[PDB]
Design a protein around this ligand. Sequence first.
Ligand SMILES: [Ca+2]
Ligand SMILES: [Ca+2]
Ligand SMILES: [Ca+2]
Ligand SMILES: [Ca+2]
Ligand SMILES: [Zn+2]
Ligand SMILES: [Zn+2]
Lengths: 615, 615, 352, 351
Amino acid sequence: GGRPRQHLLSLTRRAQKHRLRDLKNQVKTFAEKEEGGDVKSVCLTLFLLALRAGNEHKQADELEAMMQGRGFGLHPAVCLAIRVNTFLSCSQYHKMYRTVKATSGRQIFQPLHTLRNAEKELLPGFHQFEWQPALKNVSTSWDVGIIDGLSGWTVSVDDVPADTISRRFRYDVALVSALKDLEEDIMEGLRERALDDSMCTSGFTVVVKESCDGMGDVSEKHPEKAVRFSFTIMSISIRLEGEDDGITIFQEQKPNSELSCRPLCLMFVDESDHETLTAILGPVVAERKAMMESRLIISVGGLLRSFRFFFRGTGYDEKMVREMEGLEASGSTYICTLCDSTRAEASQNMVLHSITRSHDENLERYEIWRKNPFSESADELRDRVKGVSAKPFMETQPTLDALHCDIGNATEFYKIFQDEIGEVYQKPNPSREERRRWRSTLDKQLRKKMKLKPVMRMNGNYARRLMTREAVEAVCELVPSEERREALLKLMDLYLQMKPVWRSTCPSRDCPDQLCQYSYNSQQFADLLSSMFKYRYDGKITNYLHKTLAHVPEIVERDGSIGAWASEGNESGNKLFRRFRKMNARQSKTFELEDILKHHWLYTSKYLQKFMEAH
Amino acid sequence: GGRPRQHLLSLTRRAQKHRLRDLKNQVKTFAEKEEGGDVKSVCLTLFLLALRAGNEHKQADELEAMMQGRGFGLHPAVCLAIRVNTFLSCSQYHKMYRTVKATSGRQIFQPLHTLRNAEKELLPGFHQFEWQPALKNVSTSWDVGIIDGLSGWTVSVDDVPADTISRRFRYDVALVSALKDLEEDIMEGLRERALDDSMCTSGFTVVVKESCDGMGDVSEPEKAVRFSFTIMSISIRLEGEDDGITIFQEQKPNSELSCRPLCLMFVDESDHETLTAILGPVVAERKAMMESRLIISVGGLLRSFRFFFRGTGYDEKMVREMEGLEASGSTYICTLCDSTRAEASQNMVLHSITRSHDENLERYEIWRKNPFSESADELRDRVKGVSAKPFMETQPTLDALHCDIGNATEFYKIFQDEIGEVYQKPNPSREERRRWRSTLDKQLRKKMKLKPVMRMNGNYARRLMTREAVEAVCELVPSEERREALLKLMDLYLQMKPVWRSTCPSRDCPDQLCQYSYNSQQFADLLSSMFKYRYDGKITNYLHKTLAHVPEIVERDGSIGAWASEGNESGNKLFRRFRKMNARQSKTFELEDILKHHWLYTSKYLQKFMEAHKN
Amino acid sequence: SMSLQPLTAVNCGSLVQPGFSLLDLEGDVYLFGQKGWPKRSCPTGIFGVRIKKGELKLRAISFSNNSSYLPPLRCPAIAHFEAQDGKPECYLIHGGRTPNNELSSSLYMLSVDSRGCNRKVTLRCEEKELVGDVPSARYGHTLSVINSRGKTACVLFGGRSYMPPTERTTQNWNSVVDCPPQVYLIDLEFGCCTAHTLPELTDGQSFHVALARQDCVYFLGGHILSSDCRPSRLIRLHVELLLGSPVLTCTILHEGLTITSAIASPIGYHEYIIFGGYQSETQKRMECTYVGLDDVGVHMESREPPQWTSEISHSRTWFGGSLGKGTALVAIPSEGNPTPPEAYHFYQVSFQ
Amino acid sequence: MSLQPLTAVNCGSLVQPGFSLLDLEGDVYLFGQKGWPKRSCPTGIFGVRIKKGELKLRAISFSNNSSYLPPLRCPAIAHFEAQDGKPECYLIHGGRTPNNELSSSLYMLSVDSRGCNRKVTLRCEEKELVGDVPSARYGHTLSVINSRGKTACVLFGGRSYMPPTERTTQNWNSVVDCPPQVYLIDLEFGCCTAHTLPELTDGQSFHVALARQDCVYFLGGHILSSDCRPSRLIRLHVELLLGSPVLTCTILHEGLTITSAIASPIGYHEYIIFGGYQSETQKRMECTYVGLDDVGVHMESREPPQWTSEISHSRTWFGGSLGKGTALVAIPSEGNPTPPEAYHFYQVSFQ
DNA sequence: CTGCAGGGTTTTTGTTCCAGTCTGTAGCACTGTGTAAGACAGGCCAGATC
DNA sequence: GATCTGGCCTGTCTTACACAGTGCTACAGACTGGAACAAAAACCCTGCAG
Ligand SMILES: [Ca+2]
Ligand SMILES: [Ca+2]
Ligand SMILES: [Ca+2]
Ligand SMILES: [Ca+2]
Ligand SMILES: [Zn+2]
Ligand SMILES: [Zn+2]
């Protein structure tokens, strides 16, 4: 008969060897002839490919990790990244940490104190530097961390209150933090571009983008208004040593997305009151002005290397732009921000313009206003000085906005439709309710054709589903005359033709065909407006019209993009700020923003997002 | 020629299968010829031998623990424990997870959907059971889960509308879930008592404690009520002369981590209608449940269960509102005797327990029918304060927390009256009352450092009854006699506070219990001697409670600090924190989320994964 | 015509509950039924009503010694017992649903006994037992008195109820089903009770209004839950009290009306005008309804509806009762956060 | 000696903690509007009128012969007496601007024409300064003197930002009293010259002055460096010993300690005063009446009008002078929420 | 010898289809929150007026 | 020489609206096989190139 067959994994390893000696020696001689006797790797690959037969990837991946080295512990860096990236507050961390730690026998996470120790390498204040020449009226330190913003108001009762609350850094140390962070990426640009290392020590140029926006009435059950002033690295090119008009090394690839907008200052103040805003932002301005002259020295990759700067101040909505620039607010006679036209001198001539507006000449105009060396009259002085009223203080390249960039254009097309329902050049005096009747019939028409329920005000999505040759033809169904229909078709066709040019990121790379052909297209546009629709723009024009027909090509030639400076991006980070406050309150206002900024600036570094693989 | 063949550990799995095809089919034929056609165990044993022949024993032992023993990281159960025990959201959890796996392979945590499948093991509706005998007027179902709380209210606007948002469990299923939770501890208890397991499957005994009191201002309607219960103790009766063997006794019942939620409703505790209209089904459950024997397969053996209930943890206001007695501080105060208000002043201490729930019913029938044709208040006397119909049998006890806070506010206003020389001036002024408020306010602001609120919490009381703080307060009232008098009062109070705070006074302080009668008696004689000016005939409720009834209560019950209501009002903080960071959020769903989370938050099969692997 | 005036209650906003009733005893008007069990301020629940200078005031009522006290029912039935031999003047109440949502199923004969002194009223009750063969517990029905040459009795019909006690289920413990179409001929002395079936009573229903005269009764519109519909038919029974079997017959009318949870106003002996309740499950009626009746027949024609305010024509629901003799009280559930806490504005309507 | 509340009807959000006021030819003019002027009003000078207890406002304008003025915050005010050659005027210098830079440029403000319909015209001749010019500084004071017999002007007080050699951008909003050297201002030529005396041991701020017949008397103030609130009431005597602007000074004993004063004269040289604060936590509450003659100043305390409690427990306050024993004060109005009108007004008067 | 064009060689890697199987993510229903576009009132200035 | 109203201008509520956060779910795309195949990497190896 014989001994009954037992399952091989229940017998001792001696009986397993007895019953598997045949296959053991077979695989031995097979490995000798095929792979040079590498028995362990061959039996590993066979065990794996047998595991995947039953679609059981999991345990095979686990054991694969048990092989080719080990990853028992977690890099403290990634661990701090995982506390921040998820808004986990301190004690929350400590709790989950104790849990997992004494769960299974190994220190998978790192604990608090070592986390914070390793973290202190990432805030401002950790990489010494010189400055050539030494800075103009600037502190000498390089470890000075989070300075309170108040900037030493003697708490004296007599004067303007010192109750305002503020926390920030020193601009320079912030810049050096961001750069010393980005060492990995700059060395990647070096390895890609195939450029020397001993001959890349001087000719750098970093473009740094400023931005400031108000932020209203932080909602908390239990200290409402807020202002956040931040910057963002944009590009770094080479300049050594021949012609090299420009060789970019690291161009940011998600310009606006709040993942890259490093906060620098925060103040429980209101967007409105010029006073306290300047009273804090002064130091920042002083540094900025003082910095652009000198050049910067920093060790990166062992070689101390040089850095210059140019600044593109863009990130503001028009109110802030008038404020810093000194022009009225807002629906003024000096409607533009680059030309000087009123409404009218933009109405007769629309696009045949030239940008001249500049900072130091605004200073000049202001001095002229104050002294009035020609002793002319009030409105005389206003017009002869081009609407400057107040001594501005901060250089801002007053660029067009990308975020709206349409909403005036939207509501303008909306009104135009409502009027082409009507007959304006036959009845140039419509009444109160007839325009409403026409609007309602237009809206019901659209609702029946393009599924766009009526609105009160123009969001983006509304406009984007509006500006369609399809919606054009659908609304044309309503206008009677077979003639003006095709006219506005030509109109909206040109407008569609030109939209992406300004909402682009790099038309010099994206779609240069319209860019090169743009100016003539804008000309045809203005022609159609003045010829077929003069009834409405005799002397008054919408704000954004001046921009969108004025300087878009000239601005792009000045810079080379539009969206790559829109503060629309910063408007995201408000979601961050508010939640951070809701989930990492201290909470006394003195340390409230202290920790807010600490955690925020932590959130916004490359170093950690690189550990956000999800790959 | 031929391309050089690289090491086997670098090739792709398609190229690896093509390189190994020969030995792959050879291992297939060897497994099929000699091992019953199972290649998986064959290659497992082969990799085992190729490792163990290399004396790299750690890696092979870890592999052998991974197979047939659940390695695969840490656990699904511990994972859910972490995910709840620190409030991490679902997006939060997944973001942590895909990171912690992305870098540092060998995934530790588990994805979400595996926790979706895991949760089905701890909610209600999973472990089968039945009643012996079957249950009257309760459904035959057992696999149901979270039930819409209305009990299926007819929506017809003619009747009272279904204006309420409420979800709950099926009380019996909640019970069986909590019991099958306590299986680990009951098995260890059968161990420790040196008791058999296959035998003694007949005399199990469970006691259940249940409480309910909501909170105000849940907003930014607005109120809520929370009815929850907690397994208290569990003992065994077999089989005769043996009075019983306490198997498990809850070691920290007063704290949060044992308060299983069972119903929640957006109702006020005031409008007595919607309250019963919801809580009805629980009433039917309780009533029909007192008799039948429960049967669960715990520890492999389906064993009998009985039930005694002890309804305790309602704060006094509701205890009236559920005993239909006059609301609330009228001449009838003692919830346990027939005593008047004044008959508690003439005699304060010598009273017998008379209140019998079923006699409250049978006397409410005497109220209604009036067999002796008595007038209104004569009948109020003849029934001894019974007005409404009793609705829920509450065991005749009191809470610890609200009783001691009432003592705290009583001694608070005793200070606010002794700071006035009121024993000479019998009628103080309201504005002088407010100024005595302010002077005692700065008094306790100078020493012991506590703040003013218009309504009081627990720490205020526990640090408010101490002797050196009394001497910090005695330093104002001028007399030398009254100071020593009420300091003797504070001392005698410390002779008795942990007597009702006792968990088992026959252990913690039998000297303070056996002398309790004499302490209360000296208390009463002092009130009659030196403070009779205030307690001529007007007494406060909690004072009578703590003075005349404590001894018989503990003598019959076993403790008072046991059945206390600490957990409820304290964990409504956790309710709030839940609705904050875990809601859906939408009315009909806020609960069906909150309840799942709450009942999850409180299972031993999790809490052990915080303490048991902490020490 | 008919007219409305916006009122305001001075010191009462928490006694009136979604359901209540109204009663006239000897020209004197009494509210009934409060939210929450009796407070110490009034151990009765009955309240004197008053409407002056746009203000709504209230007062407490009292009882005798042989007067058993009454639990605060919410939606009972009502029928004025005509003041006659021997004991005027009763006002029967039964049996509604209780605060603890049970059903009392108890007949309470309520009347006035003495006065004053100073506008003061003293009442009594006799919770009468039912010998039978009694009607079961239920609610939402209505009943009225009849006289058959010349015996006098009182009869009920209708109502909903909880599920039968066997099939009752803890997850359905609050749903309700309509009563079986069996009418109960209620003697008062003695308190005998007898149930009667009607073969043409195609189904039970609820929430109907009805009135009797000279031993013949007409039942108006309510609701049937079988189809979730509201029949606009009308029914009529011709019944008398023959010794000793009070033989009874009933039959259908061609067309009645579609009203639910109405407001019954008297003007005269049997001339009534109704203020309407609800048309359908979400659309309430708005118009009046005059109904003449006699031994020739019921003769019916609409009336002119007043001009409602913005709120009542835009609120979700309303309810109220009649102060008697063409005078009435209504209520609107208010909307406010903060609560005023006046959740109920008050209007008064009348005739001419 | 009484108070009465006012009502900020509208235009309330345009008055800020610090500002100035000028009485001239009836109409009183507010100065120092928060933020740069709007197109609502180009100049910034507002005309204020008050009827039945209302606080209403109207805008002003200039001729072409005029310069346009920055809305300075805490300048120094000085009344030019009406006589030859060009009466009459008010002098301002130099305060801080809505941008925290500083003027160092006095202006000579006057009225020009009216009405026709009750309307006013002004001009603003900035007077260029040769010297030895004063450096920009604020909170300081100026005064006018007419010394046998030509008229000139005297400056004193002031803090600033540290000189731009230790101008430190962490402290870039510090302050420290300028070295106390008086300056002498002739109208034309603007022969500005510095002087001092050893008695001028240290210089103060927020100290209201008062002059008459070229013998000036300095009132209570404060010094940061020593953190004291000294009592050093001073007298100083000047005269034009051409070609020498000879000066003499002397300390006097009695000097009250009251900061941020509110000066409303009534008599020829009689000044009833409020005073902002007693100590840098505890405000002053009581009034003050000040005589002075060729013998000298003589003190007295009149009756304090009954401040409502709401002002009594304020954290701060300030005010200005409406003229003739009557004046205007303001409260930072704490409301939950803000109205956003942060300033109720109570009116004050004499007898 | 070099030089490249490209012939051989084995070895990556995709390559096609049908039945499963896991999982990562987008879509859905949902009311709290900031908002800025617009209705507006109400005040002011010039025009017609007293 | 002083008063009254339409046009209009500018600060002010207010209210539609996006949009963000959270569980839940559904679906789609990566994962299993046998043959039979271009197309390329880089060793080699010839063969026409001086
Ligand atoms: Ca903004
Ligand atoms: Ca914004
Ligand atoms: Ca309570
Ligand atoms: Ca409470
Ligand atoms: Zn321009
Ligand atoms: Zn008692």
